[PDB]
Design a protein around this ligand. Sequence first.
Ligand SMILES: OC[C@H]1O[C@@](CO)(O[C@H]2O[C@H](CO)[C@@H](O)[C@H](O)[C@H]2O)[C@@H](O)[C@@H]1O
Length: 464
Amino acid sequence: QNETAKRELEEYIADKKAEINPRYRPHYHISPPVGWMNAPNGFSYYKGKFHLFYQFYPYDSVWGPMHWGHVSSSNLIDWEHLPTALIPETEMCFSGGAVVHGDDLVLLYTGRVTTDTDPFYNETQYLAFSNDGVNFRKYEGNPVLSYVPDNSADFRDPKIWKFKDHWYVVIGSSSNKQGRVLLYRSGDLFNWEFLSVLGESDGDMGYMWECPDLFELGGKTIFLWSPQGLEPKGDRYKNTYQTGYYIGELDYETFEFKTDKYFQELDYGHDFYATQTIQGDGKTYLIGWFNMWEVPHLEEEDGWAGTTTLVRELQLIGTRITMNPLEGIQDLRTDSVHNGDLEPQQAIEFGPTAEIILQGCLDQKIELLIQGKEGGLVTTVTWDPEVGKVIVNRSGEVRQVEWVPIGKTSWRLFLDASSLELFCGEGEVVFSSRIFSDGDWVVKNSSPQTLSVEAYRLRRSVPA
Ligand SMILES: OC[C@H]1O[C@@](CO)(O[C@H]2O[C@H](CO)[C@@H](O)[C@H](O)[C@H]2O)[C@@H](O)[C@@H]1O
């Protein structure tokens, strides 16, 4: 590693840290120490700790020359910052995965380099290694994988896993302005054999397929990815770009992904894009970037942008991936703020953090009004039984979906200094939206019915 380049960045961060307005900084969501965060990267388990990286531009609250930020956790709730894992050189350090080989945590990441031809960039897969889980050195012979079908300039966001005697990777690409994902495999992590175009847009599924993922859940293969170029369709695909999944079966003989290509959005909120998953304890954990491309970031002017979501546990119930907060998220709970009846127009007061478990009768309207103690911008969460929809109105911008409850009719709502995550029922309908208002959260019952509300303040689990 370049000791000069590193030390200079560590001291830029340690100094720039004092200029970070804390007003919107999350208490219990992963945020960059300073500057810009986008897609989470290389979700891994190495030496008794979950490791997570992320697309990181230290020097400003907007996108720029891509670094890998780095955090670790015992419980997937509390996270410590580590030194910047990857600093760009000739290549920007674009998204990718991480896997444990020997004593080593191995990062497989896309290196984007400039060119002087129409695309004006090229994408290949770079290796970096660590034995201490702190310092990362790039492989002398990078890139280890350069071949992409139709010589497409788009070739990014490898998700690597081990099955039998091979590492497999799914990688995002385009061709004739159609999104696609490519399956490769290696015996040694250095030499990569192309297997198949796992899926491709027929025209209606966008021009680029970012942050692909592939894993088993509920006895099925999930292809989870971030397509760009979907048209809004009724209530769906309203965000700048989408994250969603196909259900099917990956055949490890034919390397064919057999699916009906029934697309579903994972998260119905305003600010959900680009996911990572890991499997352990017989569970499937997922985390996403808690922002959206080409829309205002109200925290930008405070010298930072972006958080992750809460880590969610996945299940496949029928045809639906449910998301729920971690079983032990209740460890965040400090003060018990409310229990039982919350009458019409009655309000609950928090600090910057809130957990609310609410139930009403689904025969009548449910509505929460969420706003700062000192007023400012409003977010409303509504059950409208006329249309059978959950509606998150974030400062006038609507996200809504039909909700057919699996079982539980209760909602679990998590507020952080500048975020909202609504888990409806058993997690079949989830909204993740960034929210901003003036001061400590006040939540008012706007419903024409009394709600049952269990409410807590939540402690910090991440740095300022
Ligand atoms: O930081 C690059 C990293 O982010 C992803 C997913 O968000 O792609 C981004 O890259 C470009 C940044 O301007 C955009 O063209 C693209 O739309 C944006 O999503 C990953 O694909 C990539 O590794």
